């Protein structure tokens, strides 16, 4: 695998928010998508631009305690400080004893572990979360990737009834990364589309018995993802995704997957 180096910044944002960015003043919630192939090493030159301690902690990937991002393992970052975190990944294969070592590939996420509490409750609430995708050799690559985070009662820390919306063309291969944070369980639902409940969100072939779903229960720090063919067997349209917990959809935990015809039109909606 390849050795990669990136910079990452934690920054305070308007309305008491906090975000990660690849450049100063370009912090976003969710944070930037990090994509790796199994075997790749990533060195993250992390700068905490804030006035409180902050950290970077990742799910799924290989890291040593020196890159835990915790007070326990003295790997958080002082205010205005810098730390180089290292994430490693590995491909699957048989061990010496004939057991199968699972690879790093999957839909994962990174977040703060020290803002507000020693579990990053305040950091997470304020927006310090982002997606990580680790791909296996031969994995099907998409035309676009969209990240949806159910953070307490908000989506991507947007005000209620505020999307986000995602645009595609009929036939586009669209990947979704779906992360949950905070206090509450949710159920993720997408109209007119469906996926497999497995590593890639896609059945491997006819021997894969994974349930095909369009609704999934998720809790804090769950991550999954999938790919769909936009509008496959259903056509162009305003295709809602929403939390299916009835009070949550009613309070505006809803967005649109806007699937246009090749001619740029979409069947008239609202």
Instruction: For residue 83, state whether it binds Cu ion (rule: CB under 5 A).
Output: no
Query: Is 248 annotated as belonging to a binding site?
Result: yes
Q: Cβ 228 to its own copies, closest distance in Å?
A: 10
Instruction: For residue 48, state whether it binds its own copies (rule: CB under 8 A).
Output: no
Q: Which of 115, 45, 54, 118 is nearest to 82 (CA)?
A: 45
Instruction: For residue 179, state whether it binds Cu ion (rule: CB under 5 A).
Output: no
Instruction: For residue 165, state whether it binds its own copies (rule: CB under 8 A).
Output: no
Residue with tokens 């790796």: 36
Q: Cβ 124 to its own copies, closest distance in Å?
A: 7
**Nearer to Cu ion by C-beta: 9 or 63?**
63
**Residue 148 tokens, joined:** 């949806």
Q: Sketch the per residue contact string, 127 through 156, with its own copies: x for CB under 8 A, - otherwise.
A: -------------x----------------
Q: How far apart are CA 131 and CA 148, in angstroms?
A: 9
* Sign of the CA dihedral with 226 first, then 113, 184, and 14 last: negative
Q: What is the dihedral of CA 60, 20, 161, 235, to 10 degrees?
A: -60
**C-alpha angle with apex 220: 215 to 223, nearest 5 degrees?**
60
**Nearer to Cu ion by C-beta: 139 or 162?**
162
Q: How far apart are CA 64 and CA 249, in angstroms?
A: 40
173 binds, options its own copies, Cu ion, none, Cβ within 5 to 8 A by partner type: its own copies
Size of residue set near its own copies by CB under 8 A: 99
At 247 the three-state DSSP class reads helix
Query: Is 189 annotated as belonging to a binding site?
Result: yes
**Nearer to its own copies by C-beta: 45 or 183?**
183
**Nearer to its own copies by C-beta: 81 or 103?**
103
Query: Is 45 annotated as belonging to a binding site?
Result: no
> Given the DSSP bridges, would you call strands 144-151 and 173-181 parallel, antiparallel or unpaired?
parallel
Work out the number of other CB atoms within 10 angstroms of the CB of residue 145: 17
Q: Cβ 24 to its own copies, closest distance in Å?
A: 28
List Cβ neighbours of 67 (8 Å cut-off, separation of 6 or more). 56, 58, 75, 85, 86, 87
Q: Cβ 7 to its own copies, closest distance in Å?
A: 24
Query: Is 161 annotated as belonging to a binding site?
Result: no
Q: Cβ 244 to Cu ion, closest distance in Å?
A: 6
241, 147 contact by CB (below 8 A): no
43 binds, options Cu ion, its own copies, none, Cβ within 5 to 8 A by partner type: none
User: Site residues (CB under 5 A) for Cu ion?
Assistant: 186, 191, 221, 243, 245, 248
């Amino acid at each position: 695998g390849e050795v990669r180096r990136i910079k990452l910044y934690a920054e305070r944002l308007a309305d008491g928010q906090m975000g990660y960015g690849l450049e100063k003043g370009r912090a976003t919630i969710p944070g930037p998508l990090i994509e790796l192939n199994e075997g790749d090493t990533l060195h993250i030159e992390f700068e905490n631009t804030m006035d409180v301690r902050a950290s970077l902690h990742v799910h799924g990937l290989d890291y040593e305690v020196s890159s835990d991002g915790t007070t326990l393992n003295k790997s958080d970052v002082e205010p205005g400080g810098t730390r180089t975190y290292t994430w490693r990944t590995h491909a699957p294969g048989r061990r010496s004893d004939g057991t199968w070592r699972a690879g790093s590939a999957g839909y994962w996420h990174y977040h703060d572990h020290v803002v507000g509490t020693e579990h990053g409750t305040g950091g997470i609430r304020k927006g310090l979360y982002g997606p990580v995708i680790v791909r296996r050799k031969g994995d099907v690559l998409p035309d676009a990737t969209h990240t949806i985070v159910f953070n307490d009662m908000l989506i991507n820390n947007r005000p209620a009834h505020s999307g986000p919306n995602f645009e595609a063309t009929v036939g586009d291969r669209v990947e979704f990364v779906m992360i949950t944070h905070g206090e509450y369980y949710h159920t993720f639902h997408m109209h007119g589309h469906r996926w497999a409940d497995n590593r890639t969100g896609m059945l491997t072939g006819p021997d894969d018995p994974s349930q095909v779903v369009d609704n999934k229960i998720v809790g804090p720090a769950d991550s999954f993802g999938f790919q769909v063919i936009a509008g496959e067997g259903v056509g162009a349209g305003a295709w809602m995704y929403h939390c299916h917990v009835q009070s949550h959809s009613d309070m505006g935990a809803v967005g649109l997957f806007l699937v246009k015809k090749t001619d740029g039109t979409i069947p008239g909606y609202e």
